[PDB]
Design a protein around this nucleic acid. Structure first.
Lengths: 254, 431, 95
DNA sequence: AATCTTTCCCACAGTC
DNA sequence: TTGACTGTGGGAAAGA
């Protein structure tokens, strides 16, 4: 109840009836640039974190902070002393990215292993489009980065704003290593999104042979209608994926 | 047969100059009343296909510059439901910029809960344009006219959604006159209709054009404001009231479900309700109120039936000449994210209807692109040297456009602009 | 005229003796903080090189520390990006 | 029960 | 003119 969407009036006949931390360009702070880069740069970041340094400073354009820059550029040494300096790990940028999201997207192995071992770090963080880091790890098919979140007790049965699950994206990109570990750690085999679609449907749409094979190994129900009563065989024959149809006609019946 | 043609640099510069977007627009309601047996209850608001965009005229020139008649160069359209081969009805665009499909029906033989309209388009000279689909439409048996509630309902009207209003004169099919806005004038045209935002307003507000909006689902007896989506010409505050049997009912706290015969009341305006006199809209008296203070006898021409409506849009352009492959997969980009920095500066694209035969273009620079899935694609940001030759590193922010290009050269337009982030230090990640 | 293009060409040699000699006699043109070819003063590119004696002599001879270069960054940003810890010491001490 | 969704069933007011 | 149809709305009937 704050915004307003104006227009322009119009009436029929007769209306009388109414009766030292230098701002610099953008939003970059000296500690941010220190975390972005015998060069004792880790020691430089350490000395920067002390004294009168403001850790929580967001970018004017991208909205990111110092920890976000340390996660994107894969500077794990900076993020170490940042977290030791009582920094925040649940700061949303202009796009909703938490530092964990930037660490997973940029394939920052060290920052990832440091963030999962932190207590206050959120693992079910939801961005603007609600995508969770556990979903990003399967979307980018980064090896090893997925199971470390599940062993850290992350929500595998999570949904985004649309309602897609981690297994949905694992079936879309055909990341067999993702879908296998998800289903082994208690992923819902027949979860329906807001559009009433199963992971097998998305696997058959984009030609995911191996992921559909794994879902059939884990006894996924082939006969689930979508919002238009289309079975995965229907979309497979529509997209002309004959081998997927043969898998839906032979492999692991009853 | 013509092979695929990669989009060149100067063709992209020409696109940046001219920008002849051949946009395709589809307005259609979100709810469809189902027909039983052999009946044929048509969609009260006919699906309206617009063809906005200047580049369309350019398409008229080039084809006519290659020996095509005015009848041959005119795009014929077909409308149909996808899952059934019950023949696509024909749409003609002789000298019009749009058209409405008013002879569509959905039989009970199709037990689908939702569906979506399919539009085939091709020119008279057999050159295919392609198949464009609209947003989903929900099937309904009968409007929820009873005293519904908010607990699990979702077919009511949210403040800020595109709606439409129509009329039915004494159960006559041809008497349907739709609400439209054109030339700064509110018309009751039986051939056109626009998208109307409906905003719930507090009982205490201002005169107009500036107001405190209100959230929540819309019920009867409240104060609403109607605003056309394109023109912007708004109406003064109105109060929606459900009517039945030429009698308006005001004392009602029920939610406004779909396909409802509502009435609009002006504050301190006696009983003057917004009615239609044949061709134009006029305020009508509706005096009798003898049975109950909450029962006003309103004359015919007043059963304004309300229905929500969505909007599908697909914009593109032919940057490498017309190709044989149809442009039926139109990618849309809802948002653009980041993936790394420095030498591994990558971008994640979240959208819909992506195709593996697509490549991103940072302005006029071709970048390496990977196809993750039909709604997500990764790309590598090129070096700043491609934009500024002498620059070894990003000095000041540079705003370039981001577009999508198919293998054949069909350039798709986006609304997002990439911005190179300025870097304090010179050489990054020297190795 | 020719004396103005001396510092912008002599600072690219990393010679402290020549700097101390040409600055002991000082100069009259009062070039002082002088934006170079890349718009970076001798202070900024001296921080880029990473030698504490040059930057200290510059700060000694009236070189303002809290000035933004042509692109908009101060002297602290380049010192933080380069990793030289000894430069930020004197950049913070001068405040 | 008091609501609700889903199928038929049938009389206006007009066009064919 | 009379004869065979026709989209639209409303109430009875049928489940839930």
């Amino acid at each position: 109840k704050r915004r307003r969407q104006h227009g322009q009036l119009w009436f029929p006949e007769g209306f009388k009836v109414s009766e030292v931390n230098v701002r610099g360009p953008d939003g970059f702070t000296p500690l941010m640039i220190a975390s972005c880069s015998e060069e004792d740069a880790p020691a430089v970041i350490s000395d920067f974190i002390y004294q009168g340094a403001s850790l929580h400073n967001q970018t004017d354009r991208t909205g990111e902070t110092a920890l976000h820059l340390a996660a994107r550029y894969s500077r794990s040494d900076a993020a170490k002393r940042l977290l030791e300096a009582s920094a925040d790990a649940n700061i949303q940028d202009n796009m909703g990215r938490t530092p964990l999201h930037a660490a997973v997207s940029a394939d920052a192995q060290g920052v990832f292993q440091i963030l999962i071992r932190n207590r206050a770090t959120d693992l079910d963080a939801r961005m603007h489009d609600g995508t969770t880091p556990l979903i990003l790890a399967a979307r980018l098919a980064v090896e090893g980065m997925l199971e470390d979140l599940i062993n850290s007790h992350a929500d595998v049965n999570a949904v985004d704003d649309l309602g897609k699950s981690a297994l949905h994206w694992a079936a879309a990109v055909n990341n067999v290593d993702a879908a296998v570990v998800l289903l082994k750690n208690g992923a819902n085999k027949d979860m329906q999104n807001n559009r009433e679609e199963t992971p097998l449907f998305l696997a058959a749409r984009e030609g995911s042979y191996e992921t559909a094979k794994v879902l059939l190994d884990h006894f996924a129900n082939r006969d689930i209608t979508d919002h238009m009563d289309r079975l995965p065989r229907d979309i497979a024959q529509e997209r002309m994926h004959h081998d997927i149809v043969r898998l839906l006609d032979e492999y692991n019946l009853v | 047969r013509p092979p695929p043609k990669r989009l060149t640099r100067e063709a992209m510069r020409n696109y940046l100059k001219e920008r002849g977007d051949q946009t395709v627009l589809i307005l259609h309601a979100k709810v469809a009343q189902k027909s039983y047996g052999n009946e044929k209850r048509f969609f009260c608001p006919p699906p309206c296909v617009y063809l906005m965009g200047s580049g369309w005229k350019k398409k008229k020139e080039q084809m006519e510059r290659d020996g095509c008649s005015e009848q041959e160069s005119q795009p014929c359209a077909f409308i149909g439901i996808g899952n059934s081969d019950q023949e696509m009805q024909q749409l003609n665009l002789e000298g019009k910029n749009y058209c409405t499909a008013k002879t569509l029906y959905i039989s009970d033989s199709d037990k689908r809960k939702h569906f979506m309209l399919s539009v085939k388009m091709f020119y008279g000279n057999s050159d295919d344009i392609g198949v464009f689909l609209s947003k989903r439409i929900k099937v309904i048996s009968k409007p929820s006219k009873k005293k519904q509630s908010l607990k699990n309902a979702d077919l009511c009207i949210a403040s800020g959604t595109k709606v439409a209003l129509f009329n039915r004169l004494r159960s006559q099919t041809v008497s349907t006159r739709y609400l439209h806005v054109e030339g700064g004038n509110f018309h009751a045209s039986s051939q056109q209709w626009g998208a109307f935002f409906i905003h719930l307003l507090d009982d205490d507000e201002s005169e107009g054009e500036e107001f405190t909006v209100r959230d929540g689902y819309i019920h009867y007896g409240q104060t609403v404001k109607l605003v056309c989506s394109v023109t912007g010409m708004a109406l003064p505050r109105l109060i929606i009231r459900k009517v039945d049997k030429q009698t308006a009912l005001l004392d009602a706290d029920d939610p406004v479900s779909q396909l409802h015969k509502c009435a609009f009341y002006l504050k301190d305006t006696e009983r003057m309700y917004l009615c239609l006199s044949q061709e134009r809209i006029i305020q009508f008296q509706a005096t009798p109120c003898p049975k109950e203070p909450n029962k006003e006898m309103i004359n015919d021409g007043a059963s304004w039936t309300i229905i929500s409506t969505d909007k599908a849009e697909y914009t593109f352009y032919e940057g490498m000449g017309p190709v044989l492959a149809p442009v039926t997969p139109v990618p849309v980009v809802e948002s653009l994210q980041l993936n790394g920095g420095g030498d591994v500066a990558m971008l994640e694209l979240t959208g819909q209807n992506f195709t593996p035969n697509l490549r991103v273009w940072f302005g006029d620079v071709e970048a390496e692109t990977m196809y993750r899935c039909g709604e997500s694609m990764l790309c590598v940001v090129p070096d700043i040297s491609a934009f500024r030759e002498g620059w070894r590193w990003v000095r000041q922010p540079v705003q370039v456009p981001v577009t999508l290009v198919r293998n054949d050269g069909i350039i798709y337009s986006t609304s997002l602009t990439f911005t190179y982030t300025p870097e304090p230090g010179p050489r990054p990640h020297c190795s | 005229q020719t004396q103005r293009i001396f510092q912008e060409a002599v600072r690219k040699g990393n010679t402290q003796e020549l700097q101390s000699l040409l600055q002991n006699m000082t100069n009259c043109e009062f070039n002082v903080n002088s934006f170079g070819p890349e718009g970076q003063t001798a202070l900024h590119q001296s921080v880029i090189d990473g030698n504490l004696e040059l930057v200290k002599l510059l700060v000694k001879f009236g070189a303002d520390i809290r000035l933004a270069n042509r692109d908009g960054w101060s002297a602290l940003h380049i010192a933080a990006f380069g990793g030289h810890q000894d430069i930020v010491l004197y950049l913070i001490t001068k405040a």
